């Protein structure tokens, strides 16, 4: 007994508009976002093993779920990197929590970037999966932006059952990502 904003919108308008654009036979062919992905590469694992915990705490406060700590399966010593050194955190988002996260991101933070002209239409890949990146976490009001001791940027990537970049960009437009309309 509840509905998020973007999901109600998705089931109302966007499916209709893509149908009226691309004319699929079955509606099962309709594109739909599955999951959302978050990652943070600490990179100074061999110099600060504590920024890892810092990033864990930030993403906790940001996404409302305890992250995963991705280990280094290979040992490349030109970076000090050794088998099992924690280099980064990672979180998966699916469902109502995902739609809420996109609502927050599109409505609070991305309208808080400094001189946001536009996210490119060219972060796609093969079929329409949008892989962008943030330099700082100085933007989410979710975050306690008084306590941060360093910039700890991140990298986001958005995956969809779309089959090509045209359908991907069209769907993400209907959903309200500020592309550079070109």
């Amino acid at each position: 007994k509840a509905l998020p904003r973007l999901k109600q919108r998705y089931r109302e308008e966007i499916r209709e508009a893509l149908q009226q654009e691309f004319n699929y036979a079955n509606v099962m062919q309709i594109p739909g976002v599955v999951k959302v992905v978050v990652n943070m590469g600490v990179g100074d694992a061999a110099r600060d093993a504590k920024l890892i915990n810092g990033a864990i705490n930030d993403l906790a406060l940001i996404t409302g779920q305890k992250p995963e700590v991705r280990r280094a399966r290979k040992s490349i010593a030109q970076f000090k990197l050794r088998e099992g050194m924690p280099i980064g955190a990672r979180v998966t988002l699916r469902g109502d929590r995902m739609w809420e996260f996109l609502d927050r991101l599109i409505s609070i933070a991305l309208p808080r970037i400094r001189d946001f002209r536009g996210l490119s239409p060219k972060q796609f890949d093969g079929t329409g999966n949008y892989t962008f990146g943030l330099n700082e976490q100085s933007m989410f009001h979710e975050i306690d932006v008084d306590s941060i001791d360093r910039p700890r940027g991140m990298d986001i990537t958005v995956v969809t059952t779309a089959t090509n970049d045209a359908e991907g960009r069209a769907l993400l437009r209907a959903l309200g990502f500020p592309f550079k309309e070109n």
Binding site: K66, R97, E100, R104
Partner: protein
């Protein structure tokens, strides 16, 4: 989701402090990260969060040398 608890999950009302085009919806943002004023926008009552800036208050895609001047300025 599972024990080894995550942050807590409660609703939120993001009150548009720009032009009054507010938002309100379930979230994982709560004791964790919420503001006072439990304002019911709906059949129930739940926390509120002043929204210093947003979309409809952030000019962008979704929101809104010269020689002919030189010798305009230089007469």
């Amino acid at each position: 989701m599972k024990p080894g608890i995550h942050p807590d999950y409660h609703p939120v009302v993001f009150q548009d402090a720009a032009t009054g085009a507010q938002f309100l919806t379930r979230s994982t943002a709560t004791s964790t990260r919420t503001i006072e004023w439990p304002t019911p926008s709906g059949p129930k009552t739940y926390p509120l969060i002043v929204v210093d800036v947003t979309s409809d208050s952030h000019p962008f895609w979704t929101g809104s040398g010269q020689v002919e001047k030189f010798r305009r300025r230089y007469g």
